[PDB]
Structures are given as structure tokens and as C-alpha cells.
Motif scaffolding. Structure first.
Motif, mmCIF file in Angstrom:
data_model
loop_
_atom_site.group_PDB
_atom_site.id
_atom_site.type_symbol
_atom_site.label_atom_id
_atom_site.label_comp_id
_atom_site.label_asym_id
_atom_site.label_seq_id
_atom_site.Cartn_x
_atom_site.Cartn_y
_atom_site.Cartn_z
ATOM 1 N N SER A 1 12.966 89.446 68.235
ATOM 2 C CA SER A 1 14.199 89.189 67.491
ATOM 3 C C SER A 1 14.009 89.219 65.960
ATOM 4 O O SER A 1 14.920 88.810 65.237
ATOM 5 N N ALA A 2 12.860 89.737 65.465
ATOM 6 C CA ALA A 2 12.626 89.861 64.022
ATOM 7 C C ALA A 2 13.581 90.891 63.379
ATOM 8 O O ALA A 2 13.992 90.716 62.228
ATOM 9 N N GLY A 3 13.918 91.939 64.125
ATOM 10 C CA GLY A 3 14.829 92.972 63.653
ATOM 11 C C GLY A 3 14.203 94.348 63.562
ATOM 12 O O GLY A 3 14.683 95.193 62.799
ATOM 13 N N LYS A 4 13.117 94.575 64.344
ATOM 14 C CA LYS A 4 12.377 95.831 64.364
ATOM 15 C C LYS A 4 13.256 96.989 64.807
ATOM 16 O O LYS A 4 13.343 98.005 64.106
ATOM 17 N N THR A 5 13.923 96.832 65.965
ATOM 18 C CA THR A 5 14.776 97.864 66.517
ATOM 19 C C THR A 5 15.975 98.067 65.632
ATOM 20 O O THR A 5 16.296 99.208 65.347
ATOM 21 N N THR A 6 16.591 96.988 65.128
ATOM 22 C CA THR A 6 17.755 97.055 64.212
ATOM 23 C C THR A 6 17.437 97.917 62.989
ATOM 24 O O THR A 6 18.295 98.680 62.517
ATOM 25 N N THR B 1 21.304 95.985 70.397
ATOM 26 C CA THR B 1 19.900 96.159 70.770
ATOM 27 C C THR B 1 19.601 95.345 72.014
ATOM 28 O O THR B 1 20.294 94.374 72.321
ATOM 29 N N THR C 1 13.022 94.841 73.357
ATOM 30 C CA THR C 1 12.115 95.930 73.669
ATOM 31 C C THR C 1 10.953 95.417 74.471
ATOM 32 O O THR C 1 10.175 94.587 73.983
ATOM 33 N N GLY D 1 8.122 92.700 70.958
ATOM 34 C CA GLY D 1 7.607 91.494 70.325
ATOM 35 C C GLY D 1 7.584 90.245 71.178
ATOM 36 O O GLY D 1 7.286 89.166 70.659
ATOM 37 N N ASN E 1 12.882 90.642 56.757
ATOM 38 C CA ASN E 1 14.229 90.877 57.236
ATOM 39 C C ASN E 1 14.993 89.572 57.419
ATOM 40 O O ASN E 1 14.376 88.519 57.555
ATOM 41 N N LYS E 2 16.340 89.656 57.478
ATOM 42 C CA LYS E 2 17.306 88.568 57.644
ATOM 43 C C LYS E 2 17.529 87.788 56.343
ATOM 44 O O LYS E 2 17.867 86.596 56.378
ATOM 45 N N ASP F 1 20.037 87.843 54.549
ATOM 46 C CA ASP F 1 21.437 87.486 54.528
ATOM 47 C C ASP F 1 21.664 86.079 55.085
ATOM 48 O O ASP F 1 22.590 85.401 54.660
ATOM 49 N N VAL G 1 18.003 93.402 54.990
ATOM 50 C CA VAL G 1 19.053 92.954 55.869
ATOM 51 C C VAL G 1 19.234 94.202 56.772
ATOM 52 O O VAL G 1 19.969 95.105 56.399
ATOM 53 N N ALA G 2 18.484 94.298 57.888
ATOM 54 C CA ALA G 2 18.468 95.447 58.792
ATOM 55 C C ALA G 2 19.803 95.786 59.385
ATOM 56 O O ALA G 2 20.048 96.953 59.666
HETATM 57 N N1 GTP Z 1 21.806 88.313 60.303
HETATM 58 C C1 GTP Z 1 20.896 89.245 60.604
HETATM 59 N N2 GTP Z 1 20.646 89.540 61.882
HETATM 60 C C2 GTP Z 1 19.725 90.523 62.026
HETATM 61 C C3 GTP Z 1 19.048 91.209 61.035
HETATM 62 N N3 GTP Z 1 18.223 92.176 61.592
HETATM 63 C C4 GTP Z 1 18.415 92.060 62.886
HETATM 64 N N4 GTP Z 1 19.308 91.073 63.216
HETATM 65 C C5 GTP Z 1 19.697 90.623 64.553
HETATM 66 O O1 GTP Z 1 18.571 90.013 65.147
HETATM 67 C C6 GTP Z 1 18.588 90.236 66.573
HETATM 68 C C7 GTP Z 1 17.279 90.848 67.002
HETATM 69 O O2 GTP Z 1 17.183 92.187 66.478
HETATM 70 P P1 GTP Z 1 16.307 93.257 67.255
HETATM 71 O O3 GTP Z 1 16.241 94.508 66.416
HETATM 72 O O4 GTP Z 1 16.729 93.543 68.665
HETATM 73 O O5 GTP Z 1 14.856 92.608 67.222
HETATM 74 P P2 GTP Z 1 13.426 93.092 67.725
HETATM 75 O O6 GTP Z 1 12.471 92.905 66.606
HETATM 76 O O7 GTP Z 1 13.534 94.550 68.176
HETATM 77 O O8 GTP Z 1 12.983 92.238 68.996
HETATM 78 P P3 GTP Z 1 12.100 92.616 70.262
HETATM 79 O O9 GTP Z 1 12.736 93.901 70.737
HETATM 80 O O10 GTP Z 1 12.290 91.558 71.390
HETATM 81 O O11 GTP Z 1 10.718 92.771 69.753
HETATM 82 C C8 GTP Z 1 19.844 91.055 66.856
HETATM 83 O O12 GTP Z 1 20.888 90.154 67.190
HETATM 84 C C9 GTP Z 1 20.117 91.731 65.510
HETATM 85 O O13 GTP Z 1 21.478 92.122 65.351
HETATM 86 C C10 GTP Z 1 19.325 90.857 59.664
HETATM 87 O O14 GTP Z 1 18.812 91.330 58.656
HETATM 88 N N5 GTP Z 1 20.273 89.859 59.554
#
Ligand code: GTP
Ligand code: MG
Length: 167
Positions: free
Chosen positions: A13-18, A31, A34, A55, A111-112, A114, A147-148
Motif C-alpha cells: 500500500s506504499a503506492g508502487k502500482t499507483t 489497484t 500485487t 509488498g 509518496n502520499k 498529500d 503524490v502518485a
Molecule cells: N492519498 C494518497 N493515496 C495514495 C497515494 N499513492 C497511492 N495511494 C493509494 O494507496 C493505496 C495503495 O496503492 P497501491 O499502488 O496499490 O500500493 P502498492 O505499493 O502497489 O501495494 P502492494 O501492491 O500490496 O505492494 C491505494 O488506495 C492508492 O490509491 C498518494 O500519493 N496519496
């Protein structure tokens, strides 16, 4: 033109895929966590093969083997998640001290930015201990606040990685 494997690691949930979705579509698509590897081939005039690894805790043990051949590493962090910052620092150092990837440039995506209570770039360096050169050697590193979901700083993060591969 040479292909360069880029590894994208960080906690769930760090925001890698985003970030990868923005790098391709320029949009915030839904998303799913993953649990495997999502490989995207992007061209920014050099083509790189980006490996977005999972992750989740029980998958992190595969990063060491799945990153084989990476020229650069992107470590994505949730700047607003202070309750899991010690857990991300522990994973960042496991990668930094991995004897298989000692010369690979490291981009840390803060990331995040915001979210309320997001950590500053200074705060991340301090918590992660990146202000101690002893266990970092001759590795080039950079922190990029993003802010992905909106792509803020995402183009500037990939430009640093591309600049590193051009060298
Ligand atoms: N507010 C905010 N939410 C974000 C940001 N980037 C990602 N998110 C949210 O964070 C959540 C996780 O994002 P993912 O991209 O699925 O994270 P991940 O790193 O791929 O996680 P894994 O696939 O489990 O490794 C989602 O609800 C996104 O919409 C950001 O910069 N700000
Ligand atoms: Mg993912």
C-alpha cells in the motif's frame, strides 16, 4: 537501445502500482494488492523494463531473487504512515545491505505527501538513518516527494532514474 531493469520495492500500500499506472496512463486507476510481479516496459531516449514487485510481508522475501539484473532501485514509502515507518526502514536497509546490489542507484519515493501528517524529506532521512555514510558507500541516492494518485513529482522521480541509466 539497451534495456535496463528497474526494481520497484516498498511495503504493501506504499503506492508502487499507483506510480507505475501514472507513468503509463497518466491516470489514477484502481489497484489490487500485487502478489506477484507486474512488469511494464517504458521509454523515456532509453527503454527501461520496470518490475513492480509485491509488498505484502510473505512476498518481501522474494525481492532478493526477483530483482536479479536491476540497474536501479526505486524504494516507495508511505510518508503519512508513521506507524509502519520502522518496518519500511528495516526493508530499505535489507536492500541496501544486499551484497547482490551494492552499486545500484537508489531512488526513495516519498509518496502520499498529500495526506495529513506526511513526513518531510528531512524527516525520512533522519528516521531511516540515511545521514550515516558508513553503511552507504559509493552509492548514489535521491529522495523524491510524490503524490502518485495525481502524478505530482512522478515524472521528476523517473527522470532521476533515467539520468542514472544514461551514465
Ligand atoms: N492519498 C494518497 N493515496 C495514495 C497515494 N499513492 C497511492 N495511494 C493509494 O494507496 C493505496 C495503495 O496503492 P497501491 O499502488 O496499490 O500500493 P502498492 O505499493 O502497489 O501495494 P502492494 O501492491 O500490496 O505492494 C491505494 O488506495 C492508492 O490509491 C498518494 O500519493 N496519496
Ligand atoms: Mg501493487
Amino acid at each position: 537501445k539497451k534495456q535496463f531493469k528497474i526494481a520497484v520495492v516498498g511495503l504493501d500500500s506504499a503506492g508502487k502500482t499507483t506510480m507505475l499506472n501514472f507513468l503509463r496512463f497518466e491516470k489514477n486507476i484502481e489497484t489490487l494488492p500485487t502478489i506477484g510481479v507486474n512488469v511494464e516496459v517504458l521509454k523515456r531516449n532509453v527503454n527501461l523494463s520496470i518490475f513492480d514487485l509485491g509488498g505484502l510481508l510473505h512476498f518481501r522475501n522474494l525481492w532478493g531473487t526477483l530483482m536479479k539484473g536491476s540497474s536501479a532501485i526505486i524504494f516507495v514509502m508511505d510518508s503519512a504512515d508513521r506507524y509502519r515507518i520502522e518496518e519500511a526502514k528495516n526493508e530499505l536497509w535489507k536492500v541496501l545491505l544486499d551484497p547482490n546490489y551494492p552499486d545500484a542507484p537508489l531512488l526513495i519515493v516519498a509518496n502520499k505527501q498529500d495526506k495529513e501528517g506526511a513526513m518531510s524529506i528531512q524527516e525520512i532521512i533522519s528516521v531511516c538513518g540515511l545521514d550515516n555514510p558508513e553503511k552507504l558507500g559509493n552509492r548514489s541516492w535521491h529522495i523524491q516527494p510524490t503524490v502518485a494518485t495525481t502524478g505530482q513529482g512522478v515524472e521528476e522521480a523517473i527522470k532521476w532514474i533515467v539520468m542514472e541509466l544514461d551514465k
